[PDB]
DNA sequence: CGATCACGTAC
DNA sequence: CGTACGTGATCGC
């Protein structure tokens, strides 16, 4: 049982606090908290939020440092309740990080989740309460209260296995002293935004519109017919049976018009490059112009995206609600959508900073490639050294071809080598890729020993680790069939990169942040997309942000070879190249 | 109205 | 071949 306040007291204000600050709305920017629920050891109190975050002793228990408080997801809190500009402090557990450190392949996303973990099943699955979708609802105060009265019990009720799991693992400190700090970083950046000009996105779709509707019209001319081109089916039958292109790929229920096989068929007939420019054009309309629009404040012109901490299984954040780590740059038409994002205030400037080939350079000191690493101890273009190596001629024999050949073997090697997924990126046969692995293998035979010995790993422990000891564990690596345990295995190689990259630009965060207070500098991280920061800042930061953010970034972490990170500035994210 | 499937964009 | 998210179409409810 627990007690439904009316007013706020003293015992409910006591220095060590489970803590719920519900906040139902799956978008929690500026979203209504619901209600609040605090365990301790004087009782179980649920609280009306219009009560209790205009009382000011509960206002400054949730500001006061010293008042700690065990949570789940606590920056959705925090973000909500900036929004109320309200501070929240203190916050010295995070149950969801925590589960998400010991396991993040459990996909844990409420309270109930996380203490199945430890046999505690005490609490509904928050889905079991709002219900789902259309049918999502808060619902009355009694079973509302219970709520979260449960789900703060569990939290105090989990805190010390958790913990204790997290130093077993040596995770300890990456919980309290990386993904927590971190969590309160992110939320700072998501509340600050990032303004759009959102005058330059509309007369962007409107050429976009423009141009769609004439490579529309010139589709239909070269079908001689008209259809819905956005439909996979309908143009399957303009192209492989009506006009006859052959069959180069099928899917599972008919055949693959992807971006890919279109590239194969242009020579047969003119209505394919304007399918493809159509797709592109509309890619742009669909996703990045009408797309952003959706979710920009009318009132600011932000867009505040949530960072989902708690979800990818390397360690990397993603992006929601709008994705920002997906933003076009490639193509130039599409990295023209960066001109619309802008400062926040006039006579400021964005200042972008990205570490030039992290994963490569984690490599080379994880595996202790001789021959790697010293290409990074040159600053070699490590693309043209490994065709170097791989065709074994020298760097002025390097051919456009062959370092573009060697590029691909590069992300391979990353991502987990294997002969098919290579030639089928290279558009080469199996063998053939294979005896481009064979020879990057010849030449990288510390690469070589790492891929088997952290594949043999995974095999003996049940997992692997990165820099900082995050782990994904990799059950499939035992298994019988061919496919899933190689992916596995390729897991097996790829995480401890990609993860330890994503470990050391989460401590360059907590680290920037940290000098920039500091430095008193007005500059803030607006950004990350994984292996690089945006920021905004005063035109007058910008000759000091040119020595301290990469300065701060290229010494997170002290590796075998050095970190190096390139950084621009300019009055868009655009021109921030 | 969910929910699957293709597809495409980033790193 | 790594890791994500969003959009459109399409099916069956």
């Not at 987990?416 to 890729?433: C, F, P, T, W």
């Not at 596995?488 to 920037?512: C, F, H, V, Y």
Request: proline share 4%.
């Amino acid at each position: 049982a627990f007690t439904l306040a009316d007013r706020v007291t003293e015992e409910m204000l006591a220095d060590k606090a489970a803590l719920v600050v519900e906040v139902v709305e799956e978008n929690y920017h500026d979203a209504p908290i619901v209600g609040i629920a605090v365990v301790n050891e004087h009782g179980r109190f649920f609280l009306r939020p219009e009560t209790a975050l205009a009382d000011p002793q509960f206002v400054a228990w949730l500001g006061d440092e010293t008042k700690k408080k065990s949570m789940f997801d606590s920056k959705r809190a925090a973000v909500a309740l900036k929004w109320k500009g309200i501070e929240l402090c203190g916050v010295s557990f995070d149950l969801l990080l925590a589960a998400y450190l010991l396991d993040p392949a459990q996909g844990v996303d409420d309270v109930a989740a996380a203490a199945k973990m430890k046999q505690y099943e005490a609490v509904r699955p928050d889905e079991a309460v709002y219900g789902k979708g259309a049918k999502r609802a808060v619902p009355d105060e009694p079973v509302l209260a219970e709520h979260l009265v449960r789900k703060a019990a569990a939290i105090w009720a989990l805190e010390r296995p958790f913990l204790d799991e997290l130093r077993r693992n040596e995770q300890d400190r990456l919980l309290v002293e990386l993904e927590q700090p971190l969590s309160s970083i992110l939320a700072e950046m998501e509340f600050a935004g990032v303004k759009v000009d959102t005058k330059r996105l509309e007369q962007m779709g409107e050429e976009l519109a423009e141009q769609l509707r004439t490579v529309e019209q010139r589709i239909y001319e070269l079908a001689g017919q008209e259809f819905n081109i956005n439909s996979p089916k309908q143009l399957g039958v303009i192209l492989f049976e009506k006009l006859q292109l052959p069959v180069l790929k099928k899917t599972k229920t008919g055949y693959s018009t992807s971006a890919d096989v279109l590239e194969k068929l242009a020579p047969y007939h003119e209505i394919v490059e304007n399918i493809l420019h159509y797709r592109q054009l509309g890619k742009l309309q669909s996703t990045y112009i009408e797309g952003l629009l959706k979710v920009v404040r009318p009132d600011t012109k932000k867009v505040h995206t949530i960072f989902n901490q708690a979800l990818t299984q390397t360690g990397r954040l993603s992006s929601t609600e709008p994705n920002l780590q997906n933003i076009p740059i490639r193509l130039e038409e599409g990295r023209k959508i960066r001109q619309a994002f802008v400062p926040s205030e006039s006579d400021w400037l964005i200042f972008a900073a990205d570490y030039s080939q992290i994963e490569l350079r984690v490599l080379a000191h994880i595996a202790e490639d001789d021959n790697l690493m010293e290409a990074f101890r040159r600053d070699l273009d490590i693309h043209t050294k490994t065709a170097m190596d791989i065709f074994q001629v020298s760097e002025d024999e390097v051919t456009p071809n062959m370092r573009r050949q060697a590029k691909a073997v590069n992300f391979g090697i990353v991502y987990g080598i294997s002969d098919y997924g290579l030639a089928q990126n290279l558009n080469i046969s199996r063998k053939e890729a294979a005896e481009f692995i064979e020879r990057y293998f010849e030449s990288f035979p510390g690469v070589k020993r790492y891929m088997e010995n952290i594949v043999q790993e995974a095999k003996q422990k049940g997992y692997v680790t990165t820099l900082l000891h995050r782990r994904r564990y990799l059950p499939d690596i035992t298994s019988r069939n061919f496919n899933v345990r190689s992916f596995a295995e390729r897991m097996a190689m790829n995480t401890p990169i990609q993860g330890s990259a994503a470990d050391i630009i989460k401590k360059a965060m907590i680290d920037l942040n940290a000098r920039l207070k500091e430095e008193r500098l007005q500059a803030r991280l607006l950004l990350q997309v994984h292996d690089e920061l945006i920021l905004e800042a005063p035109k007058e930061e910008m000759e000091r942000l040119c020595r301290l953010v990469p300065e701060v970034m290229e010494q997170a972490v002290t590796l075998r070879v050095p970190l190096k990170v390139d950084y621009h500035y300019g009055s868009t994210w655009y021109d921030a190249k």
